[PDB]
Amino acid sequence: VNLKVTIDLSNPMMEPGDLLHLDALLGALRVSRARAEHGDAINPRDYHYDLPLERYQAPSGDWVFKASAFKLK
RNA sequence: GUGAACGGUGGAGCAACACCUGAAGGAAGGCUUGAUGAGCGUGUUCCCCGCAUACGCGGGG
Predict the structure, then answer these.
(1) Where on strand B do bases come within 7 A of a protein Cβ?
(2) Which residues have CB under 8 Å from A25's CB, separation 6+?
């Protein structure tokens, strides 16, 4: 669908020292959703890749999510 | 699995001490509470104004 997501925030945030990836945020949200459904006793690494996101495959393994790091205006 | 997750800007501290708003400055100078109003003349049909609508009422000099 090739979409762009923007976020405005009332409180200021910590300026991220390294890249604040969208797939990281979506993975943490999916982990929180899985904790909401399947209880707190879950492996977070089972569901942190269960994202509404396509995956880019490098020529030698090394798949990444199709998200990007959050740019700041 | 948001390079995350976890993390108290805290504890103590006198604004205060001294310091006269007031020294001098005229409410004065002129001025009837007594005046005014409270008593003394005309001797009989004649001009104007309204209501009417003339049978007379009212007023006026």
Answers:
(1) 1-4
(2) A70
